[PDB]
């Protein structure tokens, strides 16, 4: 398991790619094999995107590091984060075609401009 020092290092890692990423979408990752998700790590590394599955009370303290503070209620339920550090968008298009093609999970509520974009309206990004 993870030491307190580990979790500290990881709040620092996700906070450091947080302050540096333009668009961040939070989704449900559940019901998916490591095959299809290694495929969203290939289409994630190819789209300039940072793909992570991180603890929710760890993402509360990593998101408290601004301006993602409106996502703390999308942290109840399984949580995977796509940070596009290079480009905005290219996460919210890829997660909806991944979620429509696999017919699994959600892609629930995202973050851009310092704001939360709801499930139906991330069609902006």
């Amino acid at each position: 398991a993870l030491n307190l020092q580990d979790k500290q290092a990881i709040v620092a890692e996700v906070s450091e790619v947080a302050k540096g990423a333009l668009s961040a979408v939070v989704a449900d990752s559940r019901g998916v094999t490591v095959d299809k998700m290694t495929e969203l790590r290939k289409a994630g590394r190819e789209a300039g995107v940072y793909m992570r599955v991180v603890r929710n009370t760890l993402l509360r303290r990593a998101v408290e590091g601004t301006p993602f503070e409106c996502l703390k209620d999308a942290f109840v339920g399984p949580t995977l984060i796509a940070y596009v550090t290079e480009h905005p968008g290219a996460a919210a298009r890829l997660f909806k075609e991944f979620a429509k093609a696999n017919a699994k999970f959600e892609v629930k509520a995202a973050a851009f401009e310092g704001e939360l974009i709801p499930a139906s309206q991330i069609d902006r990004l």
Binding site: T38, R41, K42, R45
Partner: protein
């Protein structure tokens, strides 16, 4: 949805192929001759993994993969048999140009980010059969 490793220009023996892919509802000779006509380009004496994708209507589509890191470092180290005791005994040498060639073949087959990732995984199948990287 069965996976095989079958010699390059060869198919239809009873113990290796017929039972293992044919008890799943799949044509034996259609697969045999379409796989020996697709893999007639693979070098002689290389088993090539073929992933047989079988459907509820018994007609299939197969993805022929590239010859294994094990078998491609068997042919590129010049060897026949890898080490029966790996990294204890060293049976041949594959230069890093052949690790990047076998990991461009396996770049067609892998999960690697960069040719560094795939050449380090074929580095691992180079140390797993005892073959030195030189």
């Amino acid at each position: 949805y069965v996976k095989l490793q079958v010699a390059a220009g060869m198919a239809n023996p009873s113990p290796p192929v017929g039972p293992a892919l044919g008890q799943q509802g799949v044509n034996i000779m259609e697969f045999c001759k379409a796989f020996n006509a697709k893999t007639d380009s693979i070098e002689k004496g290389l088993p090539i993994p073929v992933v047989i994708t079988v459907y509820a209507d018994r007609s299939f589509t197969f993805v022929t993969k590239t010859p294994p890191a094990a078998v491609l470092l068997k042919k590129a180290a010049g060897i026949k048999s890898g080490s029966g005791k790996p990294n204890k005994d060293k049976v041949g040498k594959i230069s890093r140009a052949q690790l990047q060639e076998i990991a461009q073949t396996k770049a067609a087959d892998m999960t690697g980010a960069d040719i560094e990732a795939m050449t380090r995984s074929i580095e691992g199948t180079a140390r797993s059969m005892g073959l030195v990287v030189e």
